[PDB]
Amino acid sequence: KTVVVTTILESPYVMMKKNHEMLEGNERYEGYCVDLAAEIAKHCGFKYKLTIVGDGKYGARDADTKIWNGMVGELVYGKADIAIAPLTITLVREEVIDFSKPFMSLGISIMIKKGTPIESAEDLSKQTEIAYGTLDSGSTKEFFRRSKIAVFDKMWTYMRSAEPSVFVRTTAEGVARVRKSKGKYAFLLESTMNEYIEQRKPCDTMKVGGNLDSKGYGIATPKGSSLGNAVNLAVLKLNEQGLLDKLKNKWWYDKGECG
Amino acid sequence: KTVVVTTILESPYVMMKKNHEMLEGNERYEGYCVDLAAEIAKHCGFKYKLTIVGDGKYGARDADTKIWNGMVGELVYGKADIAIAPLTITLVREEVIDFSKPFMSLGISIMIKKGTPIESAEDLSKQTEIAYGTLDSGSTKEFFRRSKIAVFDKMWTYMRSAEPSVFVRTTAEGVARVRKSKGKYAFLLESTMNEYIEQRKPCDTMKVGGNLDSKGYGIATPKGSSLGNAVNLAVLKLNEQGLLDKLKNKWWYDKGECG
Ligand SMILES: C=C(C)[C@H]1CN[C@H](C(=O)O)[C@H]1CC(=O)O
Ligand SMILES: C=C(C)[C@H]1CN[C@H](C(=O)O)[C@H]1CC(=O)O
């Protein structure tokens, strides 16, 4: 049957095309993950339908109810067959779903407004004049909440106690906060998003310092799914063919607006 | 029972300790992969024995006999339970063994003697005054042999036809050739090895340009092994704890000899 793909709108991975109202089906969407879903399906020989996760989440388990939300939840509970999105490969997700080998590398990174006198996480951690935070859901927040590393633990303590709230709900909100805060907000976000934004007008942000960790995004399937093996081999094939690098250049750099 | 680990001597992943003749068992060895094997075993709760692959290979299948050699072969044929080494995650290996999520990122990279007027693969590809090659076995050679990308295809054609042979048998041989060829040899090798060497005396090499691809090393087990799941979760746990970054710094940078 048609494979149900769950994904989520996030630039430049999945976006509704400007003229989407005139299109149908999968053709309504564009972006890195859209292109990737099409290549994976072509290599594994299946038809598929892109659907957008209802709750707008990636995947976390409620501590009380023990229910998985997000795209991971759609897989775990049988609502979707595959998740193709900037879904960070984490231990807690790997315990309940199957992940491909990573299709893209990333790490938590610092986005500043140009001119901000910050060069590293340790720099942020030692001060408060420049506020800093993360998405209020997702693997970045969890990284900090869970870290036993001294600098990241101090940052997490800072972020929980800082007022007003340093958390944002969306990547767009975080970028807007950076751009509007006159150098007094720094956003901690995945390096991929950071790099994407740095290439976009008004060219007033930049990624600074090293990344805080290293990890990858993977394609996820329900545990035991017969699709898993084929999609993993497809990811490795596409990587080896240079197609993943091509897609990254297409969506991040090829039409870069900032020099 | 005790888990049989197959690995291979390659610096700084696995090395015999200077006083190994006075030690026994796993304690004879040191390096990044030695440390990693110990952490994985501790997290998965097994005892293990480090053994060194007999044929000194990583893993490739003979086109005629269809027999797998190297550490991959030891797994496929039941001689070892787990392979812990700088074993590049490739499609052809993933078809016959199980790989963890990557424990370390890398890409094919160019090593030059300092002062060599080369900044990229495309630079090498356009000339012949500076000879360039790879290991005569391994994933780097296969990358070139198999590439359909124009620049890498031209490089492969160059390497097959260049005289004398541009291939080397070991990383040490490649480094020595770079250091001894007065800027007239460049070595194509994994970025991890390149970065390691760049930090060692006599500080006369360096990694130049971007990497030519992106990939990872993974821990490998025989297909269907019950160890697979646990070792994969261990790798993700160790990554998330910052232990993999710590090990890389330990073996590459902490005692760097070159500034
Ligand atoms: C943009 C969203 C909320 C995602 C994408 N990857 C991370 C994930 O899979 O949880 C989340 C980002 C983050 O936590 O900075
Ligand atoms: C050093 C050896 C021959 C290894 C390590 N990784 C690659 C592999 O797993 O094949 C080989 C290196 C290379 O091909 O440049």
Side-chain angles (χ1 to χ4, degrees), chain A residues 10 58-59 86-90 93 106 108 134-135 137-142 169 171 187-190 193 217:
Chain A
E10 176 79 20
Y58 281 73
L87 187 59
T88 304
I89 291 163
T90 65
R93 292 169 179 166
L106 65 123
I108 295 159
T134 69
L135 287 167
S137 173
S139 297
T140 297
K141 194 200 187 166
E142 294 302 292
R169 304 188 143 163
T171 300
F187 187 26
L188 284 149
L189 87 168
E190 292 177 337
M193 280 74 162
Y217 297 143

PDB file of all heavy atoms in Angstrom, chain A residues 10 58-59 86-90 93 106 108 134-135 137-142 169 171 187-190 193 217, ligand 1:
ATOM      1  N   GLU A  10       9.298  22.851   8.682  1.00  0.00           N
ATOM      2  CA  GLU A  10      10.439  23.552   9.245  1.00  0.00           C
ATOM      3  C   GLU A  10      11.376  23.850   8.125  1.00  0.00           C
ATOM      4  O   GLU A  10      11.742  22.946   7.386  1.00  0.00           O
ATOM      5  CB  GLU A  10      11.139  22.636  10.244  1.00  0.00           C
ATOM      6  CG  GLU A  10      12.419  23.196  10.856  1.00  0.00           C
ATOM      7  CD  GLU A  10      12.206  24.206  11.982  1.00  0.00           C
ATOM      8  OE1 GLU A  10      11.120  24.251  12.578  1.00  0.00           O
ATOM      9  OE2 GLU A  10      13.175  24.953  12.285  1.00  0.00           O
ATOM     10  N   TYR A  58       8.262  16.709  17.656  1.00  0.00           N
ATOM     11  CA  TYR A  58       9.245  15.759  17.085  1.00  0.00           C
ATOM     12  C   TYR A  58       9.181  14.423  17.776  1.00  0.00           C
ATOM     13  O   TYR A  58       8.881  13.415  17.165  1.00  0.00           O
ATOM     14  CB  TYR A  58      10.654  16.385  17.164  1.00  0.00           C
ATOM     15  CG  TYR A  58      10.831  17.391  16.051  1.00  0.00           C
ATOM     16  CD1 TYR A  58      10.176  18.647  16.087  1.00  0.00           C
ATOM     17  CD2 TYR A  58      11.582  17.076  14.926  1.00  0.00           C
ATOM     18  CE1 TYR A  58      10.345  19.571  15.064  1.00  0.00           C
ATOM     19  CE2 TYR A  58      11.733  17.995  13.871  1.00  0.00           C
ATOM     20  CZ  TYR A  58      11.115  19.225  13.950  1.00  0.00           C
ATOM     21  OH  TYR A  58      11.273  20.109  12.916  1.00  0.00           O
ATOM     22  N   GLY A  59       9.373  14.399  19.088  1.00  0.00           N
ATOM     23  CA  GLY A  59       9.101  13.166  19.792  1.00  0.00           C
ATOM     24  C   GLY A  59       9.690  13.140  21.179  1.00  0.00           C
ATOM     25  O   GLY A  59      10.884  13.166  21.328  1.00  0.00           O
ATOM     26  N   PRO A  86      13.947  16.708  10.170  1.00  0.00           N
ATOM     27  CA  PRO A  86      15.184  16.926  10.925  1.00  0.00           C
ATOM     28  C   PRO A  86      15.001  16.372  12.349  1.00  0.00           C
ATOM     29  O   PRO A  86      14.962  17.122  13.318  1.00  0.00           O
ATOM     30  CB  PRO A  86      15.362  18.458  10.920  1.00  0.00           C
ATOM     31  CG  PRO A  86      14.022  19.016  10.783  1.00  0.00           C
ATOM     32  CD  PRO A  86      13.224  17.969   9.927  1.00  0.00           C
ATOM     33  N   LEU A  87      14.859  15.043  12.421  1.00  0.00           N
ATOM     34  CA  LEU A  87      14.620  14.337  13.638  1.00  0.00           C
ATOM     35  C   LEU A  87      15.943  13.868  14.208  1.00  0.00           C
ATOM     36  O   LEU A  87      16.572  12.931  13.715  1.00  0.00           O
ATOM     37  CB  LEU A  87      13.677  13.154  13.360  1.00  0.00           C
ATOM     38  CG  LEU A  87      13.169  12.366  14.564  1.00  0.00           C
ATOM     39  CD1 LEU A  87      12.389  13.242  15.577  1.00  0.00           C
ATOM     40  CD2 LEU A  87      12.254  11.263  14.006  1.00  0.00           C
ATOM     41  N   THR A  88      16.334  14.480  15.303  1.00  0.00           N
ATOM     42  CA  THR A  88      17.631  14.191  15.919  1.00  0.00           C
ATOM     43  C   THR A  88      17.675  12.810  16.524  1.00  0.00           C
ATOM     44  O   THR A  88      16.750  12.382  17.209  1.00  0.00           O
ATOM     45  CB  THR A  88      17.922  15.245  16.973  1.00  0.00           C
ATOM     46  OG1 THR A  88      17.854  16.545  16.364  1.00  0.00           O
ATOM     47  CG2 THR A  88      19.321  15.127  17.510  1.00  0.00           C
ATOM     48  N   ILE A  89      18.734  12.092  16.218  1.00  0.00           N
ATOM     49  CA  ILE A  89      18.922  10.737  16.681  1.00  0.00           C
ATOM     50  C   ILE A  89      19.387  10.894  18.106  1.00  0.00           C
ATOM     51  O   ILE A  89      20.474  11.390  18.326  1.00  0.00           O
ATOM     52  CB  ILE A  89      19.926   9.997  15.864  1.00  0.00           C
ATOM     53  CG1 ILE A  89      19.432   9.715  14.454  1.00  0.00           C
ATOM     54  CG2 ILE A  89      20.275   8.655  16.479  1.00  0.00           C
ATOM     55  CD1 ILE A  89      20.543   9.352  13.499  1.00  0.00           C
ATOM     56  N   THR A  90      18.533  10.478  19.036  1.00  0.00           N
ATOM     57  CA  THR A  90      18.810  10.483  20.466  1.00  0.00           C
ATOM     58  C   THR A  90      18.519   9.110  21.035  1.00  0.00           C
ATOM     59  O   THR A  90      17.723   8.315  20.514  1.00  0.00           O
ATOM     60  CB  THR A  90      17.959  11.545  21.208  1.00  0.00           C
ATOM     61  OG1 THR A  90      16.567  11.192  21.115  1.00  0.00           O
ATOM     62  CG2 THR A  90      18.190  12.895  20.588  1.00  0.00           C
ATOM     63  N   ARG A  93      14.815   8.285  21.878  1.00  0.00           N
ATOM     64  CA  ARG A  93      14.023   7.922  20.701  1.00  0.00           C
ATOM     65  C   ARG A  93      14.450   6.583  20.125  1.00  0.00           C
ATOM     66  O   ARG A  93      13.615   5.801  19.735  1.00  0.00           O
ATOM     67  CB  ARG A  93      14.148   9.015  19.680  1.00  0.00           C
ATOM     68  CG  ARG A  93      13.474  10.328  20.104  1.00  0.00           C
ATOM     69  CD  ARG A  93      13.856  11.454  19.161  1.00  0.00           C
ATOM     70  NE  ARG A  93      13.221  12.702  19.527  1.00  0.00           N
ATOM     71  CZ  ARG A  93      13.560  13.890  19.066  1.00  0.00           C
ATOM     72  NH1 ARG A  93      14.572  13.992  18.218  1.00  0.00           N
ATOM     73  NH2 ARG A  93      12.890  14.970  19.465  1.00  0.00           N
ATOM     74  N   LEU A 106      24.975  17.434  12.630  1.00  0.00           N
ATOM     75  CA  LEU A 106      24.714  18.695  13.237  1.00  0.00           C
ATOM     76  C   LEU A 106      25.204  18.652  14.654  1.00  0.00           C
ATOM     77  O   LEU A 106      25.691  17.624  15.121  1.00  0.00           O
ATOM     78  CB  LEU A 106      23.229  19.024  13.224  1.00  0.00           C
ATOM     79  CG  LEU A 106      22.499  18.003  14.095  1.00  0.00           C
ATOM     80  CD1 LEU A 106      21.711  18.665  15.204  1.00  0.00           C
ATOM     81  CD2 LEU A 106      21.796  16.903  13.347  1.00  0.00           C
ATOM     82  N   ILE A 108      24.492  21.262  18.512  1.00  0.00           N
ATOM     83  CA  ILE A 108      23.926  22.435  19.116  1.00  0.00           C
ATOM     84  C   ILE A 108      24.961  23.536  18.912  1.00  0.00           C
ATOM     85  O   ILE A 108      26.185  23.330  19.045  1.00  0.00           O
ATOM     86  CB  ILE A 108      23.601  22.212  20.608  1.00  0.00           C
ATOM     87  CG1 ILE A 108      22.509  21.173  20.747  1.00  0.00           C
ATOM     88  CG2 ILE A 108      23.197  23.503  21.314  1.00  0.00           C
ATOM     89  CD1 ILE A 108      22.460  20.538  22.080  1.00  0.00           C
ATOM     90  N   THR A 134      16.887  28.256  24.410  1.00  0.00           N
ATOM     91  CA  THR A 134      16.588  27.247  23.397  1.00  0.00           C
ATOM     92  C   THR A 134      15.111  27.226  23.056  1.00  0.00           C
ATOM     93  O   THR A 134      14.289  27.963  23.651  1.00  0.00           O
ATOM     94  CB  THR A 134      16.906  25.857  23.938  1.00  0.00           C
ATOM     95  OG1 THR A 134      15.967  25.536  24.960  1.00  0.00           O
ATOM     96  CG2 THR A 134      18.217  25.781  24.619  1.00  0.00           C
ATOM     97  N   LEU A 135      14.783  26.367  22.092  1.00  0.00           N
ATOM     98  CA  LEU A 135      13.404  25.953  21.859  1.00  0.00           C
ATOM     99  C   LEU A 135      12.842  25.384  23.122  1.00  0.00           C
ATOM    100  O   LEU A 135      13.568  24.804  23.927  1.00  0.00           O
ATOM    101  CB  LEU A 135      13.327  24.981  20.711  1.00  0.00           C
ATOM    102  CG  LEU A 135      13.538  25.707  19.383  1.00  0.00           C
ATOM    103  CD1 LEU A 135      13.765  24.683  18.313  1.00  0.00           C
ATOM    104  CD2 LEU A 135      12.333  26.595  18.994  1.00  0.00           C
ATOM    105  N   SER A 137      10.765  23.040  23.337  1.00  0.00           N
ATOM    106  CA  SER A 137      10.585  21.578  23.158  1.00  0.00           C
ATOM    107  C   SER A 137      11.706  21.113  22.234  1.00  0.00           C
ATOM    108  O   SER A 137      12.162  21.877  21.390  1.00  0.00           O
ATOM    109  CB  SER A 137       9.212  21.305  22.515  1.00  0.00           C
ATOM    110  OG  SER A 137       9.010  19.957  22.148  1.00  0.00           O
ATOM    111  N   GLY A 138      12.115  19.861  22.343  1.00  0.00           N
ATOM    112  CA  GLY A 138      13.105  19.333  21.453  1.00  0.00           C
ATOM    113  C   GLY A 138      14.386  18.892  22.125  1.00  0.00           C
ATOM    114  O   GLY A 138      14.609  19.076  23.321  1.00  0.00           O
ATOM    115  N   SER A 139      15.247  18.327  21.303  1.00  0.00           N
ATOM    116  CA  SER A 139      16.468  17.703  21.763  1.00  0.00           C
ATOM    117  C   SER A 139      17.483  18.661  22.351  1.00  0.00           C
ATOM    118  O   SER A 139      18.265  18.253  23.208  1.00  0.00           O
ATOM    119  CB  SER A 139      17.096  16.928  20.635  1.00  0.00           C
ATOM    120  OG  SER A 139      16.221  15.893  20.237  1.00  0.00           O
ATOM    121  N   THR A 140      17.468  19.915  21.922  1.00  0.00           N
ATOM    122  CA  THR A 140      18.388  20.909  22.454  1.00  0.00           C
ATOM    123  C   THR A 140      18.065  21.201  23.903  1.00  0.00           C
ATOM    124  O   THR A 140      18.966  21.138  24.759  1.00  0.00           O
ATOM    125  CB  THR A 140      18.391  22.185  21.647  1.00  0.00           C
ATOM    126  OG1 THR A 140      18.848  21.907  20.309  1.00  0.00           O
ATOM    127  CG2 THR A 140      19.415  23.191  22.217  1.00  0.00           C
ATOM    128  N   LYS A 141      16.792  21.487  24.195  1.00  0.00           N
ATOM    129  CA  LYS A 141      16.376  21.671  25.575  1.00  0.00           C
ATOM    130  C   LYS A 141      16.708  20.475  26.420  1.00  0.00           C
ATOM    131  O   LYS A 141      17.243  20.634  27.512  1.00  0.00           O
ATOM    132  CB  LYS A 141      14.903  21.937  25.653  1.00  0.00           C
ATOM    133  CG  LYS A 141      14.431  22.465  27.009  1.00  0.00           C
ATOM    134  CD  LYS A 141      12.914  22.180  27.073  1.00  0.00           C
ATOM    135  CE  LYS A 141      12.223  22.781  28.286  1.00  0.00           C
ATOM    136  NZ  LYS A 141      10.717  22.737  28.056  1.00  0.00           N
ATOM    137  N   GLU A 142      16.361  19.285  25.940  1.00  0.00           N
ATOM    138  CA  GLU A 142      16.705  18.057  26.655  1.00  0.00           C
ATOM    139  C   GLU A 142      18.181  17.866  26.901  1.00  0.00           C
ATOM    140  O   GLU A 142      18.536  17.368  27.980  1.00  0.00           O
ATOM    141  CB  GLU A 142      16.154  16.801  25.951  1.00  0.00           C
ATOM    142  CG  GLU A 142      14.654  16.697  25.934  1.00  0.00           C
ATOM    143  CD  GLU A 142      14.082  16.701  27.343  1.00  0.00           C
ATOM    144  OE1 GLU A 142      14.311  15.700  28.066  1.00  0.00           O
ATOM    145  OE2 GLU A 142      13.456  17.722  27.720  1.00  0.00           O
ATOM    146  N   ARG A 169       9.274  29.354  21.117  1.00  0.00           N
ATOM    147  CA  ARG A 169       8.439  28.250  20.690  1.00  0.00           C
ATOM    148  C   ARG A 169       8.793  27.716  19.328  1.00  0.00           C
ATOM    149  O   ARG A 169       8.548  26.553  19.054  1.00  0.00           O
ATOM    150  CB  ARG A 169       6.954  28.627  20.752  1.00  0.00           C
ATOM    151  CG  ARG A 169       6.514  29.093  22.128  1.00  0.00           C
ATOM    152  CD  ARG A 169       4.958  29.302  22.281  1.00  0.00           C
ATOM    153  NE  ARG A 169       4.476  28.891  23.629  1.00  0.00           N
ATOM    154  CZ  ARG A 169       3.297  29.233  24.175  1.00  0.00           C
ATOM    155  NH1 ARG A 169       2.435  30.000  23.512  1.00  0.00           N
ATOM    156  NH2 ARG A 169       2.972  28.812  25.397  1.00  0.00           N
ATOM    157  N   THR A 171      11.673  28.161  15.740  1.00  0.00           N
ATOM    158  CA  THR A 171      12.923  28.652  15.201  1.00  0.00           C
ATOM    159  C   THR A 171      12.777  30.098  14.758  1.00  0.00           C
ATOM    160  O   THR A 171      13.601  30.936  15.093  1.00  0.00           O
ATOM    161  CB  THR A 171      13.354  27.772  14.058  1.00  0.00           C
ATOM    162  OG1 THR A 171      13.525  26.429  14.512  1.00  0.00           O
ATOM    163  CG2 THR A 171      14.718  28.211  13.506  1.00  0.00           C
ATOM    164  N   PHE A 187      20.643  32.586  20.689  1.00  0.00           N
ATOM    165  CA  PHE A 187      19.785  31.420  20.504  1.00  0.00           C
ATOM    166  C   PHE A 187      20.657  30.172  20.327  1.00  0.00           C
ATOM    167  O   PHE A 187      21.545  30.132  19.488  1.00  0.00           O
ATOM    168  CB  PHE A 187      18.927  31.692  19.243  1.00  0.00           C
ATOM    169  CG  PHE A 187      17.850  30.677  18.961  1.00  0.00           C
ATOM    170  CD1 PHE A 187      17.256  29.899  19.962  1.00  0.00           C
ATOM    171  CD2 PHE A 187      17.368  30.553  17.681  1.00  0.00           C
ATOM    172  CE1 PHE A 187      16.227  28.978  19.644  1.00  0.00           C
ATOM    173  CE2 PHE A 187      16.357  29.665  17.384  1.00  0.00           C
ATOM    174  CZ  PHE A 187      15.812  28.844  18.371  1.00  0.00           C
ATOM    175  N   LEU A 188      20.359  29.149  21.131  1.00  0.00           N
ATOM    176  CA  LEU A 188      20.983  27.872  21.068  1.00  0.00           C
ATOM    177  C   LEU A 188      20.071  26.948  20.268  1.00  0.00           C
ATOM    178  O   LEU A 188      18.912  26.723  20.635  1.00  0.00           O
ATOM    179  CB  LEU A 188      21.156  27.312  22.473  1.00  0.00           C
ATOM    180  CG  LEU A 188      22.305  27.995  23.202  1.00  0.00           C
ATOM    181  CD1 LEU A 188      21.987  28.002  24.651  1.00  0.00           C
ATOM    182  CD2 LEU A 188      23.691  27.345  22.917  1.00  0.00           C
ATOM    183  N   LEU A 189      20.581  26.519  19.139  1.00  0.00           N
ATOM    184  CA  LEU A 189      19.823  25.767  18.153  1.00  0.00           C
ATOM    185  C   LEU A 189      20.736  24.889  17.351  1.00  0.00           C
ATOM    186  O   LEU A 189      21.964  25.025  17.353  1.00  0.00           O
ATOM    187  CB  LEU A 189      19.001  26.738  17.257  1.00  0.00           C
ATOM    188  CG  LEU A 189      19.625  27.352  15.999  1.00  0.00           C
ATOM    189  CD1 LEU A 189      18.575  28.022  15.152  1.00  0.00           C
ATOM    190  CD2 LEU A 189      20.692  28.327  16.416  1.00  0.00           C
ATOM    191  N   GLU A 190      20.162  23.966  16.624  1.00  0.00           N
ATOM    192  CA  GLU A 190      20.970  23.056  15.834  1.00  0.00           C
ATOM    193  C   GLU A 190      21.726  23.785  14.712  1.00  0.00           C
ATOM    194  O   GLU A 190      21.212  24.723  14.083  1.00  0.00           O
ATOM    195  CB  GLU A 190      20.078  21.910  15.345  1.00  0.00           C
ATOM    196  CG  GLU A 190      19.672  21.073  16.555  1.00  0.00           C
ATOM    197  CD  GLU A 190      18.723  19.929  16.251  1.00  0.00           C
ATOM    198  OE1 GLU A 190      18.012  19.981  15.221  1.00  0.00           O
ATOM    199  OE2 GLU A 190      18.700  19.005  17.095  1.00  0.00           O
ATOM    200  N   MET A 193      20.141  24.559  11.253  1.00  0.00           N
ATOM    201  CA  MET A 193      19.233  25.701  11.205  1.00  0.00           C
ATOM    202  C   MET A 193      20.058  27.003  11.244  1.00  0.00           C
ATOM    203  O   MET A 193      19.790  27.930  10.535  1.00  0.00           O
ATOM    204  CB  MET A 193      18.175  25.654  12.321  1.00  0.00           C
ATOM    205  CG  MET A 193      17.015  24.751  12.069  1.00  0.00           C
ATOM    206  SD  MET A 193      17.563  23.065  12.271  1.00  0.00           S
ATOM    207  CE  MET A 193      15.992  22.269  12.482  1.00  0.00           C
ATOM    208  N   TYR A 217      20.669  13.639  12.151  1.00  0.00           N
ATOM    209  CA  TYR A 217      19.276  13.391  11.903  1.00  0.00           C
ATOM    210  C   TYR A 217      19.176  12.056  11.215  1.00  0.00           C
ATOM    211  O   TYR A 217      20.000  11.728  10.354  1.00  0.00           O
ATOM    212  CB  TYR A 217      18.700  14.435  10.965  1.00  0.00           C
ATOM    213  CG  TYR A 217      18.703  15.868  11.453  1.00  0.00           C
ATOM    214  CD1 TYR A 217      18.947  16.917  10.546  1.00  0.00           C
ATOM    215  CD2 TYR A 217      18.412  16.192  12.768  1.00  0.00           C
ATOM    216  CE1 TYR A 217      18.933  18.230  10.951  1.00  0.00           C
ATOM    217  CE2 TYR A 217      18.423  17.520  13.192  1.00  0.00           C
ATOM    218  CZ  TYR A 217      18.635  18.537  12.258  1.00  0.00           C
ATOM    219  OH  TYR A 217      18.661  19.866  12.643  1.00  0.00           O
TER     220      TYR A 217
HETATM  221  C1  LIG C   1      13.212  22.368  15.200  1.00  0.00           C
HETATM  222  C2  LIG C   1      12.766  21.247  16.074  1.00  0.00           C
HETATM  223  C3  LIG C   1      12.034  21.611  17.358  1.00  0.00           C
HETATM  224  C4  LIG C   1      13.747  20.076  16.169  1.00  0.00           C
HETATM  225  C5  LIG C   1      14.635  19.599  15.019  1.00  0.00           C
HETATM  226  N1  LIG C   1      15.622  18.724  15.709  1.00  0.00           N
HETATM  227  C6  LIG C   1      15.470  18.753  17.138  1.00  0.00           C
HETATM  228  C7  LIG C   1      14.772  17.440  17.528  1.00  0.00           C
HETATM  229  O1  LIG C   1      14.583  16.455  16.787  1.00  0.00           O
HETATM  230  O2  LIG C   1      14.283  17.342  18.730  1.00  0.00           O
HETATM  231  C8  LIG C   1      14.503  19.857  17.423  1.00  0.00           C
HETATM  232  C9  LIG C   1      15.359  21.133  17.499  1.00  0.00           C
HETATM  233  C10 LIG C   1      16.049  21.480  18.802  1.00  0.00           C
HETATM  234  O3  LIG C   1      15.797  20.833  19.807  1.00  0.00           O
HETATM  235  O4  LIG C   1      16.899  22.543  18.807  1.00  0.00           O
END
